[PDB]
Amino acid sequence: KKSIPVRGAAIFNENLSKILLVQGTESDSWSFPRGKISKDENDIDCCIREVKEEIGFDLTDYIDDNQFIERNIQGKNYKIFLISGVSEVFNFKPQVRNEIDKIEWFDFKKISKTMYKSNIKYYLINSMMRPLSMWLRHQRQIKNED
């Protein structure tokens, strides 16, 4: 069933109140970057290499140790490692094959209203909204002083 493994990276604003989407090779599309990951490598270490190479920035102490989510959409395997704690002082830009490079910061509010779709929307995150939200909700709790 699973012959080709795929993994993506989901980054949230410093206030963990908004989602950062990017434009891929597709035209009117909006989602996190993904692709094949190296085998025989620690999922975490693999993240840094795919994160620092894709986003351009590396997360040393701003990356979760054992926090990730799994979800299969349309029979397609889609894995995403939760990584929050980044700052807004640094600018993150996409760095992939020569094509289109555009950044768009969409508020989770809009994503939560995906139902309000009228034309073309990214249902990809809609399916992962459950885990993404629930899990991300946990990180917000720790934000507390205790």
Domains of the chain in sequence order? 1-146 (3.90.79.10)
CA distances from 75 to 2, 3, 85 (A): 10, 12, 31
Q: In one letter, which amino acid is 13?
A: N
Give the annotated binding-site residues for Mn(2+).
Answer: 50, 54
Report how this structure was experimentally obtained. Answer: NMR
Give the annotated binding-site residues.
Answer: 50, 54
Rounded to 5°, the CA angle 59-22-132 comes to 65
Q: 128 and 135 in contact (C-beta within 8 Å)?
A: no
**CB burial class (10 A; 0-12, 13-18, 19+) of residue 50?**
buried
